[PDB]
Amino acid sequence: PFKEVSPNSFLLDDSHALSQLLKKSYRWYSPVFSPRNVPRFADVSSITESPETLKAIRDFLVQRYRAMSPAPTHILGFDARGFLFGPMIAVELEIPFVLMRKADKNAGLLIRSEPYEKEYKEAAPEVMTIRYGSIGKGSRVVLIDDVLATGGTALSGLQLVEASDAVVVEMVSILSIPFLKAAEKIHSTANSRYKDIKFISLLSDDALTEENCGDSKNYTGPRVLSCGDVLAEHPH
Amino acid sequence: PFKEVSPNSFLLDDSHALSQLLKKSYRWYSPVFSPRNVPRFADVSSITESPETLKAIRDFLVQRYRAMSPAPTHILGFDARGFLFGPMIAVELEIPFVLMRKADKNAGLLIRSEPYEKEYKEAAPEVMTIRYGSIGKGSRVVLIDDVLATGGTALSGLQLVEASDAVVVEMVSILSIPFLKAAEKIHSTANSRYKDIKFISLLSDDALTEENCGDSKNYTGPRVLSCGDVLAEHPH
């Protein structure tokens, strides 16, 4: 089950089968093998390419939301990795799957979020939106993304659900980076108006070690190879 | 069943329940209510927000790929709408779901595609990639996206599957725009080297009429509203 690591922030007990499976299937990359500049970049492909792991995540959340009372009315996934997990859970619960995107990606009358100031060191957040009326009044929404890093996105999620006269059941993420203190900052930002928002993660990145690095060892070539340079490496 | 509209290009018979359901659930928007400049912009949210329609698409493709022999070994979805349909089919077939993304979105050693020249009128294509080794040799891959417009993306899909010493089972799309002649151009481009690639669509945009327009009538305000302007429109 989920244990409380900090006020209103829960982590699946590392003794569960899903925690052990995610820990076994997940893969990360150093800057030399990733497109972002972070010590370790967790690849979601390592999960979606793992049929067993993908089915496990699907079974656990579905079982969780069916057993819940009252049951959620909507699932709001984040662009774009949240799109990979949201739908398969929705189709089983038979509830709508709403998309949170940037204004230039979404259609219809939109509602843009109002992000906060960056606390120095660049990394300016993004304005996210959802179609006005996608989430009716009195709806119980489950927010979902693959990784909870800084929380900047989840916050737009909460503001959007709030602005729609709806309630956030909980923000669920596959993996979390406890060092970035997202659950903490959100729970106390602006006089703790989001204190009650529950956070659940299936795995902590503390659990990801060297055994999970996907970097090709001793490789001294480019990261991106063209299609042609690869075709001529085998008779065709 | 699927009927041949042009060489190696099939459309689900409009008499099927899925064709009637997609025709009923789909919604499009004019430039005034969309973020792109096209007469009609089809909103995928109109499908994912329709539990019944989403379950239908899921059941049909799963039934189709289980009955097939030999069965596909992988599902390759396109960033980002292809992510919404790919996973739920994969989890049932228990086969890996690979991601085709831009180099700055993907991790690991990548393989970039080699897109063709634009035939005037701007609209320059994109370089797509997949992780080298995500698709092994002799794999039978199913390509999937929500809409087949110009085909520029699907082509990267085909080139990537080709470059991996694998075969494309078929390129599946929910909706197609027959006017843009994508299936046609791909089937005859470069001496017809892609002549054998099969294309299947669940619906033609010819089927989408005025009854499917989501534009708010007589609305004379902005398209994007801030969260604050909306909160103060109800007691809280």
Side-chain angles (χ1 to χ4, degrees), chain A residues 33 48-49 58 92 97 103 106 108-110 112 131 222-223 225 227, chain B residues 33 48-49 58 92 97 103 106 108-112 131 222-223 225 227:
Chain A
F33 280 90
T48 69
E49 286 176 33
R58 199 283 310 268
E92 299 293 339
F97 175 68
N106 254 7
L109 267 186
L110 310 179
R112 70 170 184 267
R131 199 191 65 269
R223 192 174 78 98
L225 318 167
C227 287
Chain B
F33 280 90
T48 69
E49 286 176 33
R58 199 283 310 268
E92 299 293 339
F97 175 68
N106 254 7
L109 267 186
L110 310 179
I111 301 179
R112 70 170 184 267
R131 199 191 65 269
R223 192 174 78 98
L225 318 167
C227 287

PDB file of all heavy atoms in Angstrom, chain A residues 33 48-49 58 92 97 103 106 108-110 112 131 222-223 225 227, chain B residues 33 48-49 58 92 97 103 106 108-112 131 222-223 225 227:
ATOM      1  N   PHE A  33      23.605  10.864 -23.403  1.00  0.00           N
ATOM      2  CA  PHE A  33      22.643   9.996 -24.082  1.00  0.00           C
ATOM      3  C   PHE A  33      21.192  10.409 -23.925  1.00  0.00           C
ATOM      4  O   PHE A  33      20.295   9.605 -24.163  1.00  0.00           O
ATOM      5  CB  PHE A  33      22.790   8.562 -23.609  1.00  0.00           C
ATOM      6  CG  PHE A  33      23.916   7.825 -24.244  1.00  0.00           C
ATOM      7  CD1 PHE A  33      25.181   7.840 -23.672  1.00  0.00           C
ATOM      8  CD2 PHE A  33      23.710   7.089 -25.403  1.00  0.00           C
ATOM      9  CE1 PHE A  33      26.224   7.128 -24.242  1.00  0.00           C
ATOM     10  CE2 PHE A  33      24.746   6.374 -25.979  1.00  0.00           C
ATOM     11  CZ  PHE A  33      26.007   6.392 -25.399  1.00  0.00           C
ATOM     12  N   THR A  48       6.866   1.682 -21.399  1.00  0.00           N
ATOM     13  CA  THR A  48       5.902   1.334 -22.434  1.00  0.00           C
ATOM     14  C   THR A  48       6.393   0.192 -23.304  1.00  0.00           C
ATOM     15  O   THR A  48       5.597  -0.481 -23.932  1.00  0.00           O
ATOM     16  CB  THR A  48       5.507   2.551 -23.305  1.00  0.00           C
ATOM     17  OG1 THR A  48       6.618   2.963 -24.103  1.00  0.00           O
ATOM     18  CG2 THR A  48       5.070   3.715 -22.427  1.00  0.00           C
ATOM     19  N   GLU A  49       7.702  -0.036 -23.331  1.00  0.00           N
ATOM     20  CA  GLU A  49       8.265  -1.130 -24.122  1.00  0.00           C
ATOM     21  C   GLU A  49       8.292  -2.422 -23.300  1.00  0.00           C
ATOM     22  O   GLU A  49       8.680  -3.488 -23.786  1.00  0.00           O
ATOM     23  CB  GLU A  49       9.669  -0.775 -24.627  1.00  0.00           C
ATOM     24  CG  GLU A  49       9.682   0.230 -25.774  1.00  0.00           C
ATOM     25  CD  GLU A  49      11.086   0.649 -26.196  1.00  0.00           C
ATOM     26  OE1 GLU A  49      12.023  -0.174 -26.119  1.00  0.00           O
ATOM     27  OE2 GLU A  49      11.260   1.812 -26.613  1.00  0.00           O
ATOM     28  N   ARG A  58      -1.420  -0.604 -15.306  1.00  0.00           N
ATOM     29  CA  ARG A  58      -2.804  -0.511 -15.730  1.00  0.00           C
ATOM     30  C   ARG A  58      -3.702  -1.226 -14.727  1.00  0.00           C
ATOM     31  O   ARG A  58      -4.658  -0.634 -14.228  1.00  0.00           O
ATOM     32  CB  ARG A  58      -2.964  -1.086 -17.147  1.00  0.00           C
ATOM     33  CG  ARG A  58      -4.228  -0.665 -17.902  1.00  0.00           C
ATOM     34  CD  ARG A  58      -5.453  -1.420 -17.424  1.00  0.00           C
ATOM     35  NE  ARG A  58      -5.205  -2.861 -17.394  1.00  0.00           N
ATOM     36  CZ  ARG A  58      -5.464  -3.692 -18.398  1.00  0.00           C
ATOM     37  NH1 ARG A  58      -6.013  -3.241 -19.520  1.00  0.00           N
ATOM     38  NH2 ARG A  58      -5.193  -4.981 -18.273  1.00  0.00           N
ATOM     39  N   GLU A  92     -11.198   1.564 -19.099  1.00  0.00           N
ATOM     40  CA  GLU A  92     -11.663   0.525 -18.188  1.00  0.00           C
ATOM     41  C   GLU A  92     -12.687   1.092 -17.204  1.00  0.00           C
ATOM     42  O   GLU A  92     -13.668   0.433 -16.882  1.00  0.00           O
ATOM     43  CB  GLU A  92     -10.486  -0.095 -17.432  1.00  0.00           C
ATOM     44  CG  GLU A  92      -9.440  -0.763 -18.330  1.00  0.00           C
ATOM     45  CD  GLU A  92      -9.947  -2.007 -19.055  1.00  0.00           C
ATOM     46  OE1 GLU A  92     -10.948  -2.608 -18.607  1.00  0.00           O
ATOM     47  OE2 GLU A  92      -9.327  -2.393 -20.072  1.00  0.00           O
ATOM     48  N   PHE A  97     -11.389  11.073 -20.824  1.00  0.00           N
ATOM     49  CA  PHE A  97      -9.978  11.376 -20.640  1.00  0.00           C
ATOM     50  C   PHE A  97      -9.738  12.740 -21.270  1.00  0.00           C
ATOM     51  O   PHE A  97      -9.750  12.876 -22.493  1.00  0.00           O
ATOM     52  CB  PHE A  97      -9.078  10.353 -21.317  1.00  0.00           C
ATOM     53  CG  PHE A  97      -7.612  10.712 -21.250  1.00  0.00           C
ATOM     54  CD1 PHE A  97      -6.929  10.695 -20.034  1.00  0.00           C
ATOM     55  CD2 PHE A  97      -6.927  11.116 -22.387  1.00  0.00           C
ATOM     56  CE1 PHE A  97      -5.595  11.078 -19.961  1.00  0.00           C
ATOM     57  CE2 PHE A  97      -5.598  11.499 -22.314  1.00  0.00           C
ATOM     58  CZ  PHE A  97      -4.932  11.482 -21.103  1.00  0.00           C
ATOM     59  N   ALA A 103      -1.961  26.219 -25.379  1.00  0.00           N
ATOM     60  CA  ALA A 103      -3.004  26.812 -26.193  1.00  0.00           C
ATOM     61  C   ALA A 103      -2.869  26.493 -27.688  1.00  0.00           C
ATOM     62  O   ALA A 103      -3.860  26.149 -28.332  1.00  0.00           O
ATOM     63  CB  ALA A 103      -3.057  28.315 -25.964  1.00  0.00           C
ATOM     64  N   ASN A 106      -4.285  22.863 -28.318  1.00  0.00           N
ATOM     65  CA  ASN A 106      -5.680  22.594 -27.972  1.00  0.00           C
ATOM     66  C   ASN A 106      -6.715  23.356 -28.825  1.00  0.00           C
ATOM     67  O   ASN A 106      -6.435  24.439 -29.332  1.00  0.00           O
ATOM     68  CB  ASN A 106      -5.911  22.894 -26.489  1.00  0.00           C
ATOM     69  CG  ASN A 106      -6.046  21.639 -25.656  1.00  0.00           C
ATOM     70  OD1 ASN A 106      -5.845  20.529 -26.152  1.00  0.00           O
ATOM     71  ND2 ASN A 106      -6.398  21.804 -24.384  1.00  0.00           N
ATOM     72  N   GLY A 108     -11.087  24.578 -29.401  1.00  0.00           N
ATOM     73  CA  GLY A 108     -12.287  25.009 -28.699  1.00  0.00           C
ATOM     74  C   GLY A 108     -11.983  26.182 -27.793  1.00  0.00           C
ATOM     75  O   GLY A 108     -10.882  26.729 -27.844  1.00  0.00           O
ATOM     76  N   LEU A 109     -12.967  26.617 -27.013  1.00  0.00           N
ATOM     77  CA  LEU A 109     -12.746  27.710 -26.074  1.00  0.00           C
ATOM     78  C   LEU A 109     -11.889  27.147 -24.960  1.00  0.00           C
ATOM     79  O   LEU A 109     -12.277  26.174 -24.310  1.00  0.00           O
ATOM     80  CB  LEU A 109     -14.063  28.205 -25.500  1.00  0.00           C
ATOM     81  CG  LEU A 109     -14.677  29.371 -26.264  1.00  0.00           C
ATOM     82  CD1 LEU A 109     -15.896  29.865 -25.508  1.00  0.00           C
ATOM     83  CD2 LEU A 109     -13.637  30.482 -26.408  1.00  0.00           C
ATOM     84  N   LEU A 110     -10.731  27.759 -24.732  1.00  0.00           N
ATOM     85  CA  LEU A 110      -9.810  27.272 -23.717  1.00  0.00           C
ATOM     86  C   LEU A 110      -9.766  28.092 -22.456  1.00  0.00           C
ATOM     87  O   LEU A 110     -10.257  29.215 -22.408  1.00  0.00           O
ATOM     88  CB  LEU A 110      -8.396  27.211 -24.284  1.00  0.00           C
ATOM     89  CG  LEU A 110      -8.202  26.514 -25.630  1.00  0.00           C
ATOM     90  CD1 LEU A 110      -6.734  26.587 -25.999  1.00  0.00           C
ATOM     91  CD2 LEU A 110      -8.690  25.073 -25.568  1.00  0.00           C
ATOM     92  N   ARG A 112      -6.714  29.116 -19.901  1.00  0.00           N
ATOM     93  CA  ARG A 112      -5.275  29.053 -19.659  1.00  0.00           C
ATOM     94  C   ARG A 112      -4.981  29.177 -18.170  1.00  0.00           C
ATOM     95  O   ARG A 112      -5.723  29.834 -17.446  1.00  0.00           O
ATOM     96  CB  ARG A 112      -4.517  30.134 -20.450  1.00  0.00           C
ATOM     97  CG  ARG A 112      -4.734  31.566 -19.976  1.00  0.00           C
ATOM     98  CD  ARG A 112      -3.761  32.533 -20.642  1.00  0.00           C
ATOM     99  NE  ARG A 112      -3.926  33.883 -20.115  1.00  0.00           N
ATOM    100  CZ  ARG A 112      -4.716  34.808 -20.652  1.00  0.00           C
ATOM    101  NH1 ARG A 112      -5.391  34.546 -21.766  1.00  0.00           N
ATOM    102  NH2 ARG A 112      -4.813  36.010 -20.096  1.00  0.00           N
ATOM    103  N   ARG A 131      -9.942  22.611 -22.594  1.00  0.00           N
ATOM    104  CA  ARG A 131     -11.129  23.188 -23.212  1.00  0.00           C
ATOM    105  C   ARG A 131     -12.183  23.525 -22.152  1.00  0.00           C
ATOM    106  O   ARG A 131     -12.494  22.705 -21.285  1.00  0.00           O
ATOM    107  CB  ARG A 131     -11.709  22.240 -24.266  1.00  0.00           C
ATOM    108  CG  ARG A 131     -12.641  22.931 -25.256  1.00  0.00           C
ATOM    109  CD  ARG A 131     -13.400  21.946 -26.111  1.00  0.00           C
ATOM    110  NE  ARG A 131     -14.316  21.144 -25.313  1.00  0.00           N
ATOM    111  CZ  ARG A 131     -14.004  19.973 -24.766  1.00  0.00           C
ATOM    112  NH1 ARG A 131     -12.796  19.449 -24.931  1.00  0.00           N
ATOM    113  NH2 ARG A 131     -14.904  19.321 -24.052  1.00  0.00           N
ATOM    114  N   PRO A 222      28.360   9.455 -32.464  1.00  0.00           N
ATOM    115  CA  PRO A 222      27.276  10.430 -32.257  1.00  0.00           C
ATOM    116  C   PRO A 222      26.046   9.810 -31.569  1.00  0.00           C
ATOM    117  O   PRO A 222      25.936   8.582 -31.457  1.00  0.00           O
ATOM    118  CB  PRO A 222      26.969  10.901 -33.678  1.00  0.00           C
ATOM    119  CG  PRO A 222      27.273   9.683 -34.507  1.00  0.00           C
ATOM    120  CD  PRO A 222      28.559   9.176 -33.900  1.00  0.00           C
ATOM    121  N   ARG A 223      25.138  10.654 -31.081  1.00  0.00           N
ATOM    122  CA  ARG A 223      23.940  10.151 -30.422  1.00  0.00           C
ATOM    123  C   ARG A 223      22.862   9.839 -31.437  1.00  0.00           C
ATOM    124  O   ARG A 223      22.138   8.851 -31.292  1.00  0.00           O
ATOM    125  CB  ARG A 223      23.403  11.153 -29.407  1.00  0.00           C
ATOM    126  CG  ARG A 223      22.340  10.560 -28.508  1.00  0.00           C
ATOM    127  CD  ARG A 223      21.914  11.533 -27.419  1.00  0.00           C
ATOM    128  NE  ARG A 223      21.003  12.564 -27.904  1.00  0.00           N
ATOM    129  CZ  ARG A 223      19.682  12.502 -27.771  1.00  0.00           C
ATOM    130  NH1 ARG A 223      19.123  11.454 -27.173  1.00  0.00           N
ATOM    131  NH2 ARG A 223      18.919  13.481 -28.238  1.00  0.00           N
ATOM    132  N   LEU A 225      21.970   9.011 -35.365  1.00  0.00           N
ATOM    133  CA  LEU A 225      22.478   8.470 -36.615  1.00  0.00           C
ATOM    134  C   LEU A 225      21.388   8.605 -37.672  1.00  0.00           C
ATOM    135  O   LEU A 225      20.212   8.416 -37.366  1.00  0.00           O
ATOM    136  CB  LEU A 225      22.781   6.984 -36.428  1.00  0.00           C
ATOM    137  CG  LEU A 225      23.470   6.563 -35.133  1.00  0.00           C
ATOM    138  CD1 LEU A 225      23.392   5.060 -34.986  1.00  0.00           C
ATOM    139  CD2 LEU A 225      24.911   7.043 -35.125  1.00  0.00           C
ATOM    140  N   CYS A 227      19.209   7.557 -41.122  1.00  0.00           N
ATOM    141  CA  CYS A 227      18.676   6.291 -41.630  1.00  0.00           C
ATOM    142  C   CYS A 227      19.615   5.604 -42.608  1.00  0.00           C
ATOM    143  O   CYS A 227      19.728   4.379 -42.601  1.00  0.00           O
ATOM    144  CB  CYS A 227      17.351   6.515 -42.347  1.00  0.00           C
ATOM    145  SG  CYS A 227      15.995   6.881 -41.278  1.00  0.00           S
TER     146      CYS A 227
ATOM    147  N   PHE B  33     -11.696  28.910 -33.817  1.00  0.00           N
ATOM    148  CA  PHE B  33     -11.752  28.097 -32.603  1.00  0.00           C
ATOM    149  C   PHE B  33     -10.725  26.981 -32.536  1.00  0.00           C
ATOM    150  O   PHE B  33     -10.877  26.054 -31.746  1.00  0.00           O
ATOM    151  CB  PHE B  33     -13.132  27.493 -32.426  1.00  0.00           C
ATOM    152  CG  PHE B  33     -14.137  28.430 -31.855  1.00  0.00           C
ATOM    153  CD1 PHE B  33     -14.908  29.230 -32.687  1.00  0.00           C
ATOM    154  CD2 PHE B  33     -14.336  28.496 -30.483  1.00  0.00           C
ATOM    155  CE1 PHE B  33     -15.869  30.079 -32.160  1.00  0.00           C
ATOM    156  CE2 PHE B  33     -15.294  29.342 -29.948  1.00  0.00           C
ATOM    157  CZ  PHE B  33     -16.063  30.135 -30.787  1.00  0.00           C
ATOM    158  N   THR B  48     -11.410  10.907 -27.161  1.00  0.00           N
ATOM    159  CA  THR B  48     -10.943  10.435 -25.865  1.00  0.00           C
ATOM    160  C   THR B  48     -11.901  10.804 -24.748  1.00  0.00           C
ATOM    161  O   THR B  48     -11.893  10.175 -23.706  1.00  0.00           O
ATOM    162  CB  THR B  48      -9.512  10.929 -25.538  1.00  0.00           C
ATOM    163  OG1 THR B  48      -9.519  12.340 -25.322  1.00  0.00           O
ATOM    164  CG2 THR B  48      -8.564  10.609 -26.686  1.00  0.00           C
ATOM    165  N   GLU B  49     -12.739  11.812 -24.970  1.00  0.00           N
ATOM    166  CA  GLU B  49     -13.715  12.222 -23.961  1.00  0.00           C
ATOM    167  C   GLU B  49     -15.010  11.420 -24.116  1.00  0.00           C
ATOM    168  O   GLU B  49     -15.956  11.564 -23.337  1.00  0.00           O
ATOM    169  CB  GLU B  49     -13.992  13.728 -24.049  1.00  0.00           C
ATOM    170  CG  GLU B  49     -12.869  14.602 -23.501  1.00  0.00           C
ATOM    171  CD  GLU B  49     -13.116  16.094 -23.687  1.00  0.00           C
ATOM    172  OE1 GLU B  49     -14.284  16.535 -23.643  1.00  0.00           O
ATOM    173  OE2 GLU B  49     -12.134  16.841 -23.878  1.00  0.00           O
ATOM    174  N   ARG B  58     -10.746   0.600 -29.242  1.00  0.00           N
ATOM    175  CA  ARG B  58      -9.864  -0.323 -28.555  1.00  0.00           C
ATOM    176  C   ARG B  58     -10.267  -1.759 -28.872  1.00  0.00           C
ATOM    177  O   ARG B  58      -9.432  -2.550 -29.308  1.00  0.00           O
ATOM    178  CB  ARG B  58      -9.887  -0.049 -27.042  1.00  0.00           C
ATOM    179  CG  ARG B  58      -8.707  -0.612 -26.241  1.00  0.00           C
ATOM    180  CD  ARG B  58      -8.842  -2.103 -26.004  1.00  0.00           C
ATOM    181  NE  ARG B  58     -10.162  -2.434 -25.469  1.00  0.00           N
ATOM    182  CZ  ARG B  58     -10.455  -2.513 -24.175  1.00  0.00           C
ATOM    183  NH1 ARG B  58      -9.513  -2.315 -23.260  1.00  0.00           N
ATOM    184  NH2 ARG B  58     -11.686  -2.811 -23.795  1.00  0.00           N
ATOM    185  N   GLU B  92      -3.063  -5.031 -24.346  1.00  0.00           N
ATOM    186  CA  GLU B  92      -3.927  -6.186 -24.559  1.00  0.00           C
ATOM    187  C   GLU B  92      -3.205  -7.253 -25.383  1.00  0.00           C
ATOM    188  O   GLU B  92      -3.342  -8.441 -25.116  1.00  0.00           O
ATOM    189  CB  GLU B  92      -5.227  -5.769 -25.249  1.00  0.00           C
ATOM    190  CG  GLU B  92      -6.065  -4.759 -24.461  1.00  0.00           C
ATOM    191  CD  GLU B  92      -6.647  -5.313 -23.163  1.00  0.00           C
ATOM    192  OE1 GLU B  92      -6.759  -6.552 -23.025  1.00  0.00           O
ATOM    193  OE2 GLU B  92      -7.008  -4.501 -22.282  1.00  0.00           O
ATOM    194  N   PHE B  97       5.327  -0.992 -26.938  1.00  0.00           N
ATOM    195  CA  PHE B  97       4.822   0.201 -27.598  1.00  0.00           C
ATOM    196  C   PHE B  97       5.992   1.168 -27.710  1.00  0.00           C
ATOM    197  O   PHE B  97       6.432   1.738 -26.712  1.00  0.00           O
ATOM    198  CB  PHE B  97       3.705   0.867 -26.807  1.00  0.00           C
ATOM    199  CG  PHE B  97       3.250   2.177 -27.405  1.00  0.00           C
ATOM    200  CD1 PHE B  97       2.574   2.206 -28.626  1.00  0.00           C
ATOM    201  CD2 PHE B  97       3.538   3.382 -26.781  1.00  0.00           C
ATOM    202  CE1 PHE B  97       2.203   3.413 -29.206  1.00  0.00           C
ATOM    203  CE2 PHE B  97       3.169   4.585 -27.359  1.00  0.00           C
ATOM    204  CZ  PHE B  97       2.503   4.602 -28.570  1.00  0.00           C
ATOM    205  N   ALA B 103      14.292  14.252 -32.063  1.00  0.00           N
ATOM    206  CA  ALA B 103      15.517  13.961 -31.345  1.00  0.00           C
ATOM    207  C   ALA B 103      15.579  14.605 -29.954  1.00  0.00           C
ATOM    208  O   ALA B 103      15.961  13.943 -28.989  1.00  0.00           O
ATOM    209  CB  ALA B 103      16.723  14.363 -32.181  1.00  0.00           C
ATOM    210  N   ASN B 106      13.459  12.395 -27.464  1.00  0.00           N
ATOM    211  CA  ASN B 106      13.846  10.997 -27.278  1.00  0.00           C
ATOM    212  C   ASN B 106      15.217  10.790 -26.602  1.00  0.00           C
ATOM    213  O   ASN B 106      16.103  11.633 -26.709  1.00  0.00           O
ATOM    214  CB  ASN B 106      13.820  10.271 -28.625  1.00  0.00           C
ATOM    215  CG  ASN B 106      12.634   9.343 -28.764  1.00  0.00           C
ATOM    216  OD1 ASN B 106      11.748   9.322 -27.907  1.00  0.00           O
ATOM    217  ND2 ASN B 106      12.612   8.561 -29.839  1.00  0.00           N
ATOM    218  N   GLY B 108      18.566   7.877 -25.488  1.00  0.00           N
ATOM    219  CA  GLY B 108      19.338   6.740 -25.965  1.00  0.00           C
ATOM    220  C   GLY B 108      19.915   7.022 -27.334  1.00  0.00           C
ATOM    221  O   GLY B 108      19.828   8.150 -27.817  1.00  0.00           O
ATOM    222  N   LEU B 109      20.561   6.030 -27.937  1.00  0.00           N
ATOM    223  CA  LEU B 109      21.106   6.201 -29.278  1.00  0.00           C
ATOM    224  C   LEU B 109      19.919   6.220 -30.220  1.00  0.00           C
ATOM    225  O   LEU B 109      19.141   5.264 -30.255  1.00  0.00           O
ATOM    226  CB  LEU B 109      22.023   5.045 -29.641  1.00  0.00           C
ATOM    227  CG  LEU B 109      23.493   5.293 -29.329  1.00  0.00           C
ATOM    228  CD1 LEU B 109      24.312   4.139 -29.874  1.00  0.00           C
ATOM    229  CD2 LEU B 109      23.926   6.616 -29.959  1.00  0.00           C
ATOM    230  N   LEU B 110      19.784   7.297 -30.985  1.00  0.00           N
ATOM    231  CA  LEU B 110      18.655   7.440 -31.891  1.00  0.00           C
ATOM    232  C   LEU B 110      18.977   7.227 -33.345  1.00  0.00           C
ATOM    233  O   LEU B 110      20.137   7.208 -33.744  1.00  0.00           O
ATOM    234  CB  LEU B 110      18.046   8.830 -31.747  1.00  0.00           C
ATOM    235  CG  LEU B 110      17.727   9.322 -30.336  1.00  0.00           C
ATOM    236  CD1 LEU B 110      17.148  10.719 -30.435  1.00  0.00           C
ATOM    237  CD2 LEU B 110      16.767   8.370 -29.635  1.00  0.00           C
ATOM    238  N   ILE B 111      17.916   7.074 -34.130  1.00  0.00           N
ATOM    239  CA  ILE B 111      17.995   6.912 -35.574  1.00  0.00           C
ATOM    240  C   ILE B 111      17.068   7.993 -36.133  1.00  0.00           C
ATOM    241  O   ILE B 111      15.861   7.934 -35.916  1.00  0.00           O
ATOM    242  CB  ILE B 111      17.441   5.543 -36.032  1.00  0.00           C
ATOM    243  CG1 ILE B 111      18.211   4.402 -35.376  1.00  0.00           C
ATOM    244  CG2 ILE B 111      17.521   5.420 -37.541  1.00  0.00           C
ATOM    245  CD1 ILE B 111      17.689   3.037 -35.766  1.00  0.00           C
ATOM    246  N   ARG B 112      17.622   9.005 -36.792  1.00  0.00           N
ATOM    247  CA  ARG B 112      16.786  10.064 -37.352  1.00  0.00           C
ATOM    248  C   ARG B 112      16.349   9.706 -38.766  1.00  0.00           C
ATOM    249  O   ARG B 112      17.073   9.018 -39.480  1.00  0.00           O
ATOM    250  CB  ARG B 112      17.506  11.425 -37.339  1.00  0.00           C
ATOM    251  CG  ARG B 112      18.671  11.559 -38.311  1.00  0.00           C
ATOM    252  CD  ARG B 112      19.156  13.001 -38.413  1.00  0.00           C
ATOM    253  NE  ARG B 112      20.214  13.127 -39.410  1.00  0.00           N
ATOM    254  CZ  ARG B 112      21.514  13.043 -39.141  1.00  0.00           C
ATOM    255  NH1 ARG B 112      21.928  12.875 -37.890  1.00  0.00           N
ATOM    256  NH2 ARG B 112      22.407  13.158 -40.117  1.00  0.00           N
ATOM    257  N   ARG B 131      14.582   5.154 -30.800  1.00  0.00           N
ATOM    258  CA  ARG B 131      15.815   4.652 -30.207  1.00  0.00           C
ATOM    259  C   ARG B 131      16.342   3.445 -30.989  1.00  0.00           C
ATOM    260  O   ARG B 131      15.594   2.515 -31.299  1.00  0.00           O
ATOM    261  CB  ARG B 131      15.600   4.288 -28.734  1.00  0.00           C
ATOM    262  CG  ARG B 131      16.897   4.200 -27.936  1.00  0.00           C
ATOM    263  CD  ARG B 131      16.690   3.587 -26.572  1.00  0.00           C
ATOM    264  NE  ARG B 131      16.277   2.195 -26.672  1.00  0.00           N
ATOM    265  CZ  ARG B 131      15.012   1.790 -26.716  1.00  0.00           C
ATOM    266  NH1 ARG B 131      14.018   2.668 -26.664  1.00  0.00           N
ATOM    267  NH2 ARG B 131      14.738   0.502 -26.813  1.00  0.00           N
ATOM    268  N   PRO B 222     -12.860  36.254 -26.646  1.00  0.00           N
ATOM    269  CA  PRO B 222     -11.567  35.623 -26.963  1.00  0.00           C
ATOM    270  C   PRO B 222     -11.642  34.085 -26.964  1.00  0.00           C
ATOM    271  O   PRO B 222     -12.630  33.501 -26.499  1.00  0.00           O
ATOM    272  CB  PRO B 222     -10.651  36.158 -25.863  1.00  0.00           C
ATOM    273  CG  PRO B 222     -11.590  36.326 -24.699  1.00  0.00           C
ATOM    274  CD  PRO B 222     -12.812  36.940 -25.340  1.00  0.00           C
ATOM    275  N   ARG B 223     -10.620  33.432 -27.512  1.00  0.00           N
ATOM    276  CA  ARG B 223     -10.608  31.975 -27.547  1.00  0.00           C
ATOM    277  C   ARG B 223     -10.059  31.413 -26.253  1.00  0.00           C
ATOM    278  O   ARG B 223     -10.549  30.395 -25.759  1.00  0.00           O
ATOM    279  CB  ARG B 223      -9.780  31.454 -28.715  1.00  0.00           C
ATOM    280  CG  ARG B 223      -9.972  29.973 -28.953  1.00  0.00           C
ATOM    281  CD  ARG B 223      -9.242  29.502 -30.202  1.00  0.00           C
ATOM    282  NE  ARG B 223      -7.809  29.335 -29.993  1.00  0.00           N
ATOM    283  CZ  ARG B 223      -7.233  28.165 -29.733  1.00  0.00           C
ATOM    284  NH1 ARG B 223      -7.974  27.064 -29.647  1.00  0.00           N
ATOM    285  NH2 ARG B 223      -5.921  28.094 -29.555  1.00  0.00           N
ATOM    286  N   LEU B 225      -9.263  32.082 -22.275  1.00  0.00           N
ATOM    287  CA  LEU B 225      -9.636  32.847 -21.097  1.00  0.00           C
ATOM    288  C   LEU B 225      -8.700  32.457 -19.958  1.00  0.00           C
ATOM    289  O   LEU B 225      -8.347  31.285 -19.831  1.00  0.00           O
ATOM    290  CB  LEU B 225     -11.061  32.477 -20.692  1.00  0.00           C
ATOM    291  CG  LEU B 225     -12.094  32.331 -21.807  1.00  0.00           C
ATOM    292  CD1 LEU B 225     -13.333  31.658 -21.260  1.00  0.00           C
ATOM    293  CD2 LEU B 225     -12.422  33.690 -22.401  1.00  0.00           C
ATOM    294  N   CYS B 227      -7.566  31.777 -15.957  1.00  0.00           N
ATOM    295  CA  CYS B 227      -8.211  31.099 -14.830  1.00  0.00           C
ATOM    296  C   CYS B 227      -8.990  32.049 -13.936  1.00  0.00           C
ATOM    297  O   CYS B 227     -10.059  31.694 -13.440  1.00  0.00           O
ATOM    298  CB  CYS B 227      -7.173  30.399 -13.962  1.00  0.00           C
ATOM    299  SG  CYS B 227      -6.474  28.949 -14.686  1.00  0.00           S
TER     300      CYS B 227
END
